[PDB]
Every structure is written in structure tokens, then in C-alpha cells.
Design a protein around this ligand. Structure first.
Ligand SMILES: Cc1cc2nc3c(=O)[nH]c(=O)nc-3n(C[C@H](O)[C@H](O)[C@H](O)COP(=O)(O)O)c2cc1C
Ligand SMILES: CC/C=C/C[C@H]1C(=O)C=C[C@H]1CCCCCCCC(=O)O
Length: 353
């Protein structure tokens, strides 16, 4: 089989990656009681490769960052200890593991919050109800409390502490979750951020929160161990922007000075990531609808340095290998993306026969 660009080694920060197929972050809702579980050791281990980059599922930085059931956290000593074994399994196969640190912001309900308090956000406007992945149940959200100006630095601090805890659990680095309408994207998107203080009113102001987090995290553990994910063109969670391309350009240009390990950008569903890749001086990871053919073509056209896969990695533990041999791929079952079984639809997808 002819060699392909996707299998090419890549240097990223202090890391020497052996190939460019990246495991995208994937919330699977199987971390009972918000504590990483033993079955995660196997899941991540099955997808680990020597020098392959793995980005773990969104991980909550504090009690207020919960907007879903059984997603892992990393704010307690119990959670930190539960992560170590998982981090160890990935390391045992030569993998590079980044922990994605996350806060849902207004995408939550008072029932998920400490003492039944209201979710927090850049605004005080709640989300409209959405149909849950099972097509039957409906998710309802609580109108958030608008964070005050002086409270914001305390939230930036939670990302900082989470990043430190991630390092303590053995993670190679952390990915700041700045996408999909969650807390950070809420501050960035003008359809959401109607603040009238220094954290709103302009492109620069809307991005302040995101960049303040980058700085605190980078300072806490070193920029070469930090990455960030953004989705300028995504509208998920009523978080669109009137000028996506400019929003995106602004972020990658601002991110250059931090010398991060990488910038992970989600493809638009005329919108393009070409200008962003051109503006960003570091490692560029793209994601969103890629297959073997598109992945190689993105590298050939020099649109990215790394290509992250979500859905195909869910159903193909050995995706990098399958791509390399140009082998057939298991289909993925969305019906078990978010179910809670320790094995079904989680660790029971087959390796190349
Ligand atoms: C089941 C599932 C869980 C996801 N969980 C996360 C997450 O925790 N954090 C995140 O930033 N993106 C998350 N995503 C978005 C994916 O990382 C990825 O960007 C998206 O699936 C586009 O990729 P694809 O076409 O290769 O699947 C998730 C997607 C799916 C389908
Ligand atoms: C796409 C955004 C993903 C992200 O960035 C963090 C989590 C993902 C959202 C999916 C959560 C699963 C919903 C569970 C409720 C249901 O069953 O619908």
C-alpha cells in the first residue's frame, strides 16, 4: 500500500508524533458520579498508538461546570487519582494524552448545580429546549446567572487549577475547550455575549475570557503543553456569530504570541479555514467530517498539520492502522454514543480482523 500523508510523523511542540490521525475529544457519558472509571483505561488504551495524539473527552473543571450526567471531572483528589490509571495505559503504548478541560456555562440546569444554584454564563439568557440524542426526551436548561466582572478571574482560575490537576494525573498536556457554545465560546460569540463591561462589546472584548484562560493555563504548566479548540462557524447551542471568519482570524492571530502546542479548529458545516491556517504560525489541527481521502487531501493542500477524527475513531480503535493499510472501516452506531454501558458501543468495536 502506498504511503500516505496521514501516516507521516509530525513535530508538535515538545512532542514527536509518529502520525497525523488524532483522536478527537469525545464525551461518552460513562464516568459514573463524575469520576473517571476503569473501563476508560481500556477504551483509551485500545486507541493508543506509539506517538499518536489522543485528546480526551471534555472534562469538567468544577461543580458548576456540569451540564450532563456522568462526564468526568478533575477538580477533586479522587478524580485525579482515578485518571492516573487511564493516563498510564495510554503512556504504556507510547501515546501522547491531552486532557480537554471544560465548563458548560449556561448549557446546564439548576439540578446539575451545587445546592440547586443557577448555571453561570457571560449572559443571563437561557437556552431553548432541545431534543436529546434519543429523540424522545427533551433537555431543559436553566436561565444562567450573568457572571459579574470580578467573578470571572475566579473562573479563569478553575481552568488553571484543572490544568495543574491534569498534569498531576500524568497528562502530557491540556486542550482548552473553547468550542460548541460552551462557556468560553459563549463569551466569544456575539449572538450570546451581550455584556457591556470589558468582557463584551467588541471582538477583542469577547475574546478576553478565552485568552485570559490561555495565559493562566500556559503560565501554570507551560505553553508547549497547551492546546485550544474553537469552532468559529459552529452555531451549536445558539452560539453563532455575525462575523465568524473575522472572529476566527482574530483568535488565531492572538494565539500566535502564546506559542501553544496547537490550535484545533472545527470545519464549517463562503466559510473556510484556509485564512485561519495561513494566519496561525503553529500546529493546526482541523476536524469535522473528514475521511481518509479528505484527510490526506487536507495535508497535500497544506490546510492543516494534523487531522482529528471523532465518529470514525469511536467505531475504529485502530483507525490510524486502518487508514495506513487503506482498510475497510467499522460503521459507528450513534445510538450508543451517549449511553452508559461500560462496554456496549464503547469498548466493543473490533480491531482489524
Ligand atoms: C459522540 C460525540 C462526542 C463528542 N464529544 C466532544 C467533546 O467532549 N469535546 C469536543 O470538543 N467535541 C466533542 N465532539 C465533537 C467532535 O470532537 C468532532 O469535532 C466532531 O465529531 C467532528 O468530527 P467527525 O466528523 O470526525 O466525527 C463530540 C462528537 C461526538 C459525535
Ligand atoms: C458537540 C458538542 C460536544 C461537546 O463539545 C461536549 C459534549 C458534546 C455534546 C454532546 C453531549 C451528549 C448529550 C447527552 C444528552 C442526550 O442524550 O442528548
Amino acid at each position: 500500500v502506498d504511503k500516505i500523508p496521514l501516516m507521516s510523523p509530525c513535530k508538535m511542540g515538545k512532542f514527536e508524533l509518529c502520525h497525523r490521525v488524532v483522536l478527537a475529544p469525545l464525551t461518552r457519558q460513562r464516568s459514573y458520579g463524575y469520576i473517571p472509571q476503569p473501563h476508560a483505561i481500556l477504551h483509551y488504551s485500545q486507541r493508543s498508538t506509539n506517538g499518536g495524539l489522543l485528546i480526551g473527552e471534555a472534562t469538567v473543571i468544577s461543580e458548576t461546570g456540569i451540564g450532563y450526567k456522568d462526564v468526568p471531572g478533575i477538580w477533586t483528589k479522587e478524580q485525579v487519582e482515578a485518571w492516573k490509571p487511564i493516563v498510564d495505559a495510554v503512556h504504556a503504548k507510547g501515546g501522547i494524552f491531552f486532557c480537554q478541560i471544560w465548563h458548560v456555562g449556561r448549557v446546564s440546569n439548576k439540578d446539575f448545580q451545587p445546592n440547586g444554584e443557577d448555571p453561570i454564563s457571560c449572559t443571563d439568557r437561557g437556552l431553548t429546549p432541545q431534543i436529546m440524542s434519543n429523540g424522545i426526551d427533551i433537555a431543559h436548561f436553566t436561565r444562567p446567572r450573568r457572571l459579574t466582572t470580578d467573578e470571572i478571574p475566579q473562573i479563569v482560575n478553575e481552568f488553571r487549577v484543572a490544568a495543574r490537576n491534569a498534569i498531576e494525573a500524568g497528562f502530557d498536556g491540556v486542550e482548552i475547550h473553547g468550542a460548541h457554545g460552551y462557556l468560553i465560546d459563549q463569551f466569544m460569540k456575539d449572538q450570546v455575549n451581550d455584556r457591556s463591561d470589558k468582557y463584551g462589546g467588541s471582538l477583542e472584548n469577547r475574546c478576553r475570557f478565552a485568552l485570559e484562560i490561555v495565559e493562566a493555563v500556559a503560565n501554570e504548566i507551560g505553553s508547549d503543553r497547551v492546546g485550544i479548540r474553537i469552532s468559529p462557524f459552529a452555531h451549536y447551542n445558539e452560539a453563532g456569530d455575525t462575523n465568524p471568519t473575522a472572529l476566527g482570524l482574530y483568535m488565531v492571530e492572538s494565539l500566535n504570541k502564546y506559542d501553544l502546542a496547537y490550535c484545533h479548529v472545527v470545519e464549517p458545516r463562503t466559510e473556510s479555514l484556509v485564512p485561519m491556517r495561513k494566519a496561525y504560525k503553529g500546529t493546526f489541527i482541523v476536524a469535522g467530517g473528514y475521511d481518509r481521502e479528505d484527510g490526506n487531501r487536507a495535508l497535500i493542500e497544506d490546510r492543516a498539520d494534523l487531522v482529528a477524527y471523532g465518529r470514525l475513531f469511536i467505531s475504529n480503535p485502530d483507525l490510524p492502522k486502518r487508514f495506513e493499510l487503506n482498510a475497510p472501516l467499522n460503521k459507528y452506531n450513534r445510538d450508543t454514543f451517549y449511553t452508559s454501558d461500560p462496554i456496549v458501543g464503547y469498548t466493543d468495536y473490533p480491531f482489524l480482523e
